[PDB]
Enzyme design. Structure first.
Site, PDB file in Angstrom:
ATOM      1  N   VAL A 122       0.863  -1.168   0.000  1.00  0.00           N
ATOM      2  CA  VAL A 122       0.000   0.000   0.000  1.00  0.00           C
ATOM      3  C   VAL A 122       0.906   1.227   0.000  1.00  0.00           C
ATOM      4  O   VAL A 122       1.988   1.206   0.587  1.00  0.00           O
ATOM      5  CB  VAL A 122      -0.915   0.023   1.258  1.00  0.00           C
ATOM      6  CG1 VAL A 122      -1.513   1.412   1.464  1.00  0.00           C
ATOM      7  CG2 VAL A 122      -2.023  -1.001   1.100  1.00  0.00           C
ATOM      8  N   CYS A 123       0.491   2.278  -0.696  1.00  0.00           N
ATOM      9  CA  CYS A 123       1.264   3.512  -0.711  1.00  0.00           C
ATOM     10  C   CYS A 123       2.677   3.298  -1.265  1.00  0.00           C
ATOM     11  O   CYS A 123       2.872   2.502  -2.180  1.00  0.00           O
ATOM     12  CB  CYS A 123       1.318   4.068   0.717  1.00  0.00           C
ATOM     13  SG  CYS A 123       1.714   5.819   0.861  1.00  0.00           S
ATOM     14  N   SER A 124       3.668   3.989  -0.703  1.00  0.00           N
ATOM     15  CA  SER A 124       5.037   3.850  -1.198  1.00  0.00           C
ATOM     16  C   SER A 124       5.633   2.472  -0.930  1.00  0.00           C
ATOM     17  O   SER A 124       6.787   2.212  -1.262  1.00  0.00           O
ATOM     18  CB  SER A 124       5.944   4.932  -0.601  1.00  0.00           C
ATOM     19  OG  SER A 124       5.960   4.868   0.811  1.00  0.00           O
ATOM     20  N   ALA A 172      -3.070   2.405  -3.570  1.00  0.00           N
ATOM     21  CA  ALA A 172      -2.456   3.717  -3.704  1.00  0.00           C
ATOM     22  C   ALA A 172      -2.083   4.317  -2.351  1.00  0.00           C
ATOM     23  O   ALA A 172      -1.874   3.599  -1.375  1.00  0.00           O
ATOM     24  CB  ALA A 172      -3.382   4.654  -4.462  1.00  0.00           C
TER      25      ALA A 172
END
Lengths: 242, 242
Positions: A122-124, A172
């Site tokens: 998730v995310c970076s 994201a």
């Protein structure tokens, strides 16, 4: 195990729902991670009855998030099971770049990723998956500030809140972890189970403002945030070899 | 403090945004809490530059959530500041009932609540606020499984995701903490600051299913979950004196 003893009567229409499971889920944690990146998904994975979740880190010492919240790992790269149902990596900024540049962390991710049924982030966190060589030719998303950097790891940057390509599923930025998680619950069990988890967590968001995406946020907010993350965006690109 | 040195240029339209603040925020944690209840808000409160967040517990020993995630407290009822900008309590089930029945915890909540600028909670955390005598005549919400129990503490159960009555602000079940948090960020600073936090956390949810509320969830899911939480609902009512 005195309790739970037996499930309450769910009703005549719930006899086929896969209530029990035996998933092995490893969630990487590291200093500087954005804790919501971990907890959004944890909230959903934690709803799986019978599943075993491992909070994996380089060592068992508590790790402090980018906002100061400390989490205690329950496994190290050495004690984490070899074969997993799900391998997961959360995001953050400088802490994430450090994790994505740490030889031991990458070795662990690469090894476990070679046998995990699902490779997720998730995310970076997708920068870690990429640096570990787990996104070769795979579509994947990330936080908007570093999504394009993924191309450097052989991935295909895709602008969607949740992206699935074969057994690679990525969410994201930050809060996207909840949508990623709910979808994972349905994937692992079924839609009805996921709906129960959604109702239990009352996941029917009603954001008080409308700036959660680059397309609806005020131009001045977008401009300001693009500048604020500029340092991270450049470091992410550098990490990916640009 | 070598870094941050100076903020990047946010743009000509951001000179009046209250970037800096000095809020004192105390967030109660206890064994068995639902971690998302804490982290959703923490994600938002953590975005406040200059604010000091205290993770308060009966002791500094790590507390394990209802799903097994352990968090390390940073303050005890004794080291937590006397005057706070925000006092906050997360939810859970048996762990929450235990916290709402613990004399030391209630004494702490009652004392700090007498001087806190804002008294808040998410999910079943409002049972703790009520048991501490902080909701006398105040409208407040909670998880749907125990919202009505609040009346026993002198509160006015209100069915809304986020409820504000004077300086009492409460969020509904689990994920509602994010909406509660984003609203708090705007309350403490301004809407533009909140929008920046929303964009940074990419908070533009897109739930894969539609069972996040009692009114849209399939009848069989509602029925099943009402039965599953039956034990908690009854214990909550008992706690509230019914």
């Amino acid at each position: 195990s005195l309790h739970p003893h037996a499930m309450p009567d769910m009703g005549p229409d719930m006899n086929k729902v896969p209530w029990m499971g035996d998933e092995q889920i490893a969630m990487l944690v590291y200093p500087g991670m954005t804790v919501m990146d971990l907890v959004g998904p944890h909230c959903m994975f934690g709803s799986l009855m019978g599943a075993k979740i491992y909070i994996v880190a380089k060592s068992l010492d508590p790790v402090t998030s980018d906002a100061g919240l400390a989490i205690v790992p329950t496994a190290t790269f050495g004690t984490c099971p070899r074969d997993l149902t799900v391998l997961f990596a959360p995001g953050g900024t400088d802490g994430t770049l450090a994790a994505a540049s740490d030889a031991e962390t990458l070795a662990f991710m690469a090894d476990r990723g070679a046998r995990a049924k699902y490779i997720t982030s998730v995310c970076s966190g997708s920068l870690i998956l990429g640096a570990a060589g787990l996104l070769k030719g795979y579509k994947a998303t990330s936080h908007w500030s570093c999504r394009d950097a993924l191309a450097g790891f052989g991935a295909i940057p895709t602008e969607a809140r949740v992206v699935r390509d074969r057994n690679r599923i990525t969410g994201a930025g930050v809060t996207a972890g909840l949508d990623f998680g709910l979808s994972m619950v349905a994937e692992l069990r079924d839609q009805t189970y996921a709906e129960c988890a959604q109702l239990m967590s009352e996941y029917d968001p009603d954001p008080p403002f409308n700036a959660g995406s680059m397309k609806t946020a005020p131009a001045h907010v977008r401009t300001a945030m693009i500048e604020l993350v500029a340092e991270f965006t450049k470091k992410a690109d550098a990490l990916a070899g640009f």
